[PDB]
Amino acid sequence: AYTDVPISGMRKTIAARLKESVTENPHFFVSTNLSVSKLLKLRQALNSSADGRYKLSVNDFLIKAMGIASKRVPTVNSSWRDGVIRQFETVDVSVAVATPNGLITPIVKGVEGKGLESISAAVKELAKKARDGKLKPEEYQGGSISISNMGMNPAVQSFTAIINPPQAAILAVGAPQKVAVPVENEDGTTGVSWDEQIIVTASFDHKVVDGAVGAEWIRELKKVIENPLELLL
Amino acid sequence: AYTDVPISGMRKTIAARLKESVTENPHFFVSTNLSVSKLLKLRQALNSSADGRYKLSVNDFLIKAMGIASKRVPTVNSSWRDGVIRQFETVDVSVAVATPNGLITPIVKGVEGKGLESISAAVKELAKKARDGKLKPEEYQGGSISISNMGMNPAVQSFTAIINPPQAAILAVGAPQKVAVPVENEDGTTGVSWDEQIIVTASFDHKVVDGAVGAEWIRELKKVIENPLELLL
Amino acid sequence: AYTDVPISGMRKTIAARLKESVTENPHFFVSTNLSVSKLLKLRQALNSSADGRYKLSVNDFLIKAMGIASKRVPTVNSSWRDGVIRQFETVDVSVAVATPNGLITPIVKGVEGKGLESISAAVKELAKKARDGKLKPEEYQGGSISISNMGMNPAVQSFTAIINPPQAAILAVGAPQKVAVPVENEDGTTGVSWDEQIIVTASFDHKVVDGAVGAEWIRELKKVIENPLELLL
Amino acid sequence: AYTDVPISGMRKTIAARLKESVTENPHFFVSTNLSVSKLLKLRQALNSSADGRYKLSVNDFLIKAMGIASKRVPTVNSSWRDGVIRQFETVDVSVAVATPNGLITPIVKGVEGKGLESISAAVKELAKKARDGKLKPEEYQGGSISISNMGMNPAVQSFTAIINPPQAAILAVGAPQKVAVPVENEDGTTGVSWDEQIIVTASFDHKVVDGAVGAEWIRELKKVIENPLELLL
Amino acid sequence: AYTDVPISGMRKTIAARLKESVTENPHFFVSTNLSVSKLLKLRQALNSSADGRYKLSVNDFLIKAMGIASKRVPTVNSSWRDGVIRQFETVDVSVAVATPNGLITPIVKGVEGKGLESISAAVKELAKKARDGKLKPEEYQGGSISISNMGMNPAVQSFTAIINPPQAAILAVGAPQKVAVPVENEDGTTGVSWDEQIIVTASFDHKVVDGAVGAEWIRELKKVIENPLELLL
Amino acid sequence: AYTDVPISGMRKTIAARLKESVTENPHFFVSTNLSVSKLLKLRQALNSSADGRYKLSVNDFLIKAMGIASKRVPTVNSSWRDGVIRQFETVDVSVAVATPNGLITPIVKGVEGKGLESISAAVKELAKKARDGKLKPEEYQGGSISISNMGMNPAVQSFTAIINPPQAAILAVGAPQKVAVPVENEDGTTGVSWDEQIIVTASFDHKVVDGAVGAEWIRELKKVIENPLELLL
Amino acid sequence: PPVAVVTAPISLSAAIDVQNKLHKTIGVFLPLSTFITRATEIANQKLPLPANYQPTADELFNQVLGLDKVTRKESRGSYTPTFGSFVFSLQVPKSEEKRAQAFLQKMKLVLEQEPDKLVR
Amino acid sequence: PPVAVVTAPISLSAAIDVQNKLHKTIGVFLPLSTFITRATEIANQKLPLPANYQPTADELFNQVLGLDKVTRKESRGSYTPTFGSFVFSLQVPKSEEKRAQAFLQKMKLVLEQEPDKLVR
Amino acid sequence: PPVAVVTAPISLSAAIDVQNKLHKTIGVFLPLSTFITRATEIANQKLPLPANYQPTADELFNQVLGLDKVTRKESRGSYTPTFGSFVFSLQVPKSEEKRAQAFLQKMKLVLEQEPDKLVR
């Protein structure tokens, strides 16, 4: 006793692509933990001084910090062509939107020279059009880096993702959690404080990137996130 | 008893231009007072977490806030031509540099999509080249808004400036000072606090701008300056 | 990259007029600070003893005080014609109304012999008709003095305005603010009190008015405003 | 209903001159605030040790300080002729006297090498002759700087003035007022003190002077006024 | 034993007129009591801030309040002609001046659009000319309402007056007196306070006016008097 | 046993002159004591508010006070010629500089119309050139008054000086010392205070000056010195 | 706007004892009222905050920066009790009701174990 | 400017008693001066006004409006007595002479029936 | 910047006696700490100035004029001692070292001959 359903035409188009990525790009992973208390405080401060114009989220902050880190270390903002390496100077980020019909790949352009409001508005307009199924092809064709977030589900601590064919890196974000940290109380002792953290995983190709480059990339991202004011410069 | 010095060739090139601006552009001014305690705290916080890469100043913050305010109210980012109005979409700011051979106006491009570090580096490279007298002509030809600062002299509280020929606005910044303000003490009373303020004057042309537009422009600049975190937004 | 918009037919009708005023009328400005706590107390006292017949505002008080000050010093209630000076005996005030189709100047007549209720009713009927675009030409042709207010925007402390062609004075009102003042406490000491003030700027022509006349005009206006009961006198 | 008065012969002689100044000299203004408590204490100390020989006033102190500041920065003590710049070495100041037949400008010579008593005696003899209408023409023909004071009217906080045709600067003085300042009490805290201040405005031409030169001029004037003993130096 | 004096020529001119008024105009009276403490306080406040320009009195306040009440209820500002009713739009008030030669009837014009100072100056100039016997006939011919005051004599509590031939109302004012009133002390009891009051009588014709109209007229007068600030609007 | 040295050529030029002065000018002396505590306090106040521009001394103050006293009493600013008296209107002062080659006589001009800084700069430039032996003859030819100071040596309390041939007065200044003075303590008694004083000697000719004139001269000098503020007027 | 009340008994014997004794050794006699106010002053010094407290702009800005990284959990107040004994009652909204209680017990302790403290 | 003086006797026995007693039970010893100043402070709190008092602009304006419809009949002061006993004297103009008296009797009552009050 | 220290012994028996006695007659019990602070307050009132004191502009200007012809020789301070007994020590630079001593002896006198003074 069982049932069989014919394979969809669109299911092979992604199956072949996924099968090509693994056999074409060696993978190596890097993990880190980020404290995001200050970022939450900033967001709360900036989401109450408004009258209804906008509303922000963590993903926009991560996108902007990604752009800055890409700028400081440009070797990740590259690509592997037939017989030559391609190096860019503009950062385009690919965001993943899930719908019952499948997974899309909206794009955001000019992140380096942009603010949070425009990024949010673009990500939401594109998410709406992706859900409503009137997306032009040029709008989801190519980027430099890809991001995935699963913070809506508290049961996902950390996970991995596959790199897209022409790209050389991808980032995966988990859900927040709480951990104990040591605090030097002014009385001259050590006490327990409760910090909130997220675990970030990055997958890199080893033909265009090396371990040290990825480690430096993670360091710049962390420095930009833990200290949020540095998002200005 | 007296002495005479022949008029310089460059002094009439500027004398004729200044004499043309007054008879070609009616002027109306607007004044405001800004509190910059939070901006100084921010600057101190961001100038100590560095190792020597950069060093910031108030002018960069004012330039970025100017760009944001220009974006929200685009009627000022305009120009008056022979028989048509010119409206731009990119903000270029003209900064004034004083030298013994007279003042000069280095130009900064792409301020909207930029950070404080790049603005500071550009303003200082151009200031150095202006002082050393090797400036190309294309580098000081045209912008949309002009800024003047005199905070190096504590004896200048507020002052006025003349608008450039093709532009339709100019901003003048004074030196800081201290004033008394009311504070609602937690005990349930009113007390005296000592705030630090600057007085900003803006001169506008009345053929391209009206009073309400200038008032709104000043409001956006003030909102962005008093709350500095909104510089990210 | 830029955009162009054709100049409107009504924008040159005002551009030429503004360009004629600056080259025809030399300008000199005078500034003063007025305390309006007692006026606010009066307004609150007179806006609660009513049942719905009316509702007052600061502009009406300033208009009436302007009329009284004009009566005491008549040299400002004048005009400069081709080869003769014109001196009036009735005070007509021009109020400025801003609309998307540009600003407009409704006119109020017989202010000297009038009360606050009639002035408010006229200013509001004319503001409504100006907004609805059914204003007759005779209703905005000529006056003796012009007033501008920007107290709706708290970011405007003080500003300047251009004089109309046939008139010889204009008044600009800013937004309120708070300052410290000395109070002689009954115990026999000096303490700090928090007064609310507005900054008023007046622009005058120097062919029909002199500095002393403008200073006296400002003195009469201030005396009438700080002591509000004298509005009856 | 109205009345007409023929234009006076002397009113056009001044109307044409004022109309020529605006279209011939671009204007830019600078403002500052001066503390004059120490100057009032000095004046009280020097007006009680006399037996009737003299009696001083603030205007003499401002005139002498103006002369010293002119000496330190000589670029303002200049003039713009047809095709040559004129630079002087002696400071002559023009004072304004108001009479019903219009304002007049008595002149004081050799201010740099003079004392307060001679300046007061000259200013009062010339004021008397100006009021009595027996002034020779040579006595009001030319100077280097012009001063205007309106401290007789407490309702004038700050105001602007027009520059004379052959001169390149003018100073306008307002009336005193009281403001709060911070004082470091000997107990080791911060308290409120009530200082008395005046607001001084200076109007400059931009063909002979630049912004930095005017700012330095204001700085020298302020330094000489706040510290009054330096008047001897 | 007795004496006889021939009747004067001017005594019949008034006797006939008085005899015609009674037989031509039916009369009905209305009385009210007004509290005037606040009015006295206002007058004291406004008679001390002056330097000698003017000096006010109760009659001017009553005249202005009469004008306002006439404006609100216009049926009293009318007249009865041969076969038609006359309704006006301007308020002219007739004041009574007593002299040894007889009783005069000076007039004040344009009360609605006027201030207290002008009313006082007119009433005093006319009183002087009436006493000096050089009064033109046009100056005492017709009005709309007539007023009589006898507050100089403390022995007159209330009295009646006769209406003039062409007019339809007259007002009579008595002398002040003191009465006890109840006050709700903050402790939660009732106490005695001493208020000062005047008794006002109004005589009306019943062909042009009815009882309700006169009652409303008295109500408007009372409301304007007890609350004196309402004299502004 | 002894030694002999030939007389120098320059030693007779001064010997003859000194021998001519005594036999040509009768001499009479006048002495006084001056308190200089306030002058020292002033000098300390004015030598700390500078950044390195200048540095003052007592001699400049004495020179300026001399000039003022000369102006008040002009009979000392004179000279005795063959058969006529010479009276000047400009004060030139001769200062004495000692060098191993002999005694020089530098000159300062225009002291009346001058400040302390210029006097110090001139006295020091001339002292340097006198020490370096490149002094032009015109620079040490004639003056009106001569001054000598010996305050560098504490062992000189008072001394005399010889008058120059064409001049009619000379002043000699000693070294400071300390003396006891009575002070009226607020408790109602008398106490001891320690004042610092200098002794000033003046030598006068009796053909051009009399005793009363010299006494008045000393009085003006004393009044100007003890009260130092009076150096302004 | 729902409102709620909190109550607590009290015993004033010790204050009576201190007043009587002070009257016998020096001469000073003072009313119970000053004891009540002085206890109220020492009480409104260290009271917790409502769990639904929303911060202001300055507070968040200073945290986002790093000047006051250690937050606060105390805040003064201005309460006035209601008279009564054998009781002290207060009426306040629901949000602060809990904070108003810390006040009642603090005064309830000081006035029963520290009456002497409220003397000079 | 005519001037007049007012005088009143005094007895300082009770203050002496309080000082002595306080010295014997604790150790505190203080001078009469602080009693004098402290009595002067509690006195200059509630003193009537001269019958020829003229108000100011703010006062009349507030009345003409209706904020302070209930007027005032009290006003503080700053007096300093003159030493003496078996007397306290003050010198003041005629207008206030009466007000200066309310001060003398108020202190004359407190210092004779309330000396203990001026202790802590 | 050379630094130096000054020290002085102390005896706290009298303060103990006053505390015990006060506890037996009224009920008030207070710690030694308030005695220490109150003594420190009365001490920092009249302390000489360093011999190498440099005046400011306002001071010299007022002298040059004639308003404050009588100069000053005293100035307040803000010191905090260090705990200890059988000693009180302070650490200060060389210039003020002498001034810091006037403070130690002043407190050393008041606390041994005037403990009662630090009571209400």
Residue numbers in the entry:
A (entry chain B), B (entry chain A), C (entry chain D), D (entry chain G), E (entry chain F), F (entry chain I): 226 to 458
G (entry chain C), H (entry chain E), I (entry chain H): 264 to 349, 392 to 425
Paper text:
The pyruvate dehydrogenase complex (PDC) is a central metabolic enzyme in all living cells composed majorly of E1, E2, and E3. The 2-oxoacid dehydrogenase complexes are a class of protein complexes with acyl-transferase activity in metabolism and amino acid synthesis. They co-localize 3 catalytic components (E1-3) that act in sequence upon a substrate-carrying lipoyl domain(LD) that is flexibly linked to E2. Like mammals, fungi also utilize E3BP to recruit E321,23–25. The cryo-EM reconstruction of the CBD from N.crassa E3BP inside the PDC core here reveals its oligomeric form and specific interactions.
CBD-occupied E2-trimers were selected by classification, and mapped back to the cores particles from which they were extracted, which permitted analysis of how many CBD trimers were found within each core particle. The majority of E2 core particles had 3-4 CBD trimers assigned, whereas only 4% were assigned 5 or more CBD-trimers. The analysis was repeated using native PDC data EMPIAR-1048929, which found a highly similar CBD-trimer distribution. Increased uncertainty in both classified proportions and attained were however noted due to the higher overall noise in this data, to the extent that it can only quantifiably corroborate the existence and predominance of the CBD trimer in native samples compared to the recombinant expression, and conversely cannot confirm specific interactions observed in the latter. Additionally, the trimeric form of N.crassa CBD provides a steric limit to 12 bound copies of E3BP per core assembly.
